[PDB]
Amino acid sequence: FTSDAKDKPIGCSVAISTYSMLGHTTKRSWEAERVMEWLKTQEWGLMILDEVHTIPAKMFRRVLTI
DNA sequence: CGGCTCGAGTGTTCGATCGCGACTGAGGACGAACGCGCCCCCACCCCCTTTTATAGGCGCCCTTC
Structure with a gap:
């Protein structure tokens, strides 16, 4: 993707x-919508994460949401 | 002692620039199919000699104006 x-x-x-x-506001409208909607239907497996010691908690909220 | 207001450094697609290459039509130069025609090889059968007896046609050379 x-x-x-x-x-x-x-x-x-x-x-x-x-x-x-x-997932940008306004600039990325229908682009991020087709990625988020079509992902919750045919995928729900493992959330592979790498190097998470520098990512804040604000980004982690949008990961489990989409 | 607790909140909140600039600056400096990262991250990320995606707005904005402009070089290079695909497509397609016209012009210049070179190679192939087929073109021309002297020279050369094989096949068929003409050229040339001599002696006997006859005689018309016509060239060569002594002599005269």
């Missing part, structure tokens, strides 16, 4: 994203 790819948006759940840095 990141680095401008969008390889097979429907038909697979194993993806490599970047936490929740893809």
Whole structure:
């Protein structure tokens, strides 16, 4: 979903994203909406996290929300 | 002793710039198919000699104006 790819948006759940840095206000309206809606339907597995000792608690709230 | 107001340094897609390359039509230069025609090889059968007997056609050379 990141680095401008969008390889097979429907038909697979194993993806490599970047936490929740893809959710800008107004500038990213319908872009982040299709990513959040289509993810809660065909994916709900493991939340693989790496290097979380520098990420604040504000970003963690948007991860479990989307 | 407790809250709140600038500055400096990161992160991230995504607004804004402008070089290079795909597509397609016209012009210049070179190679291939097929073009021309002297030279050369094989096959068929003409050229040339001599002696006998006859005689028309016509060239060469002594002599005269």
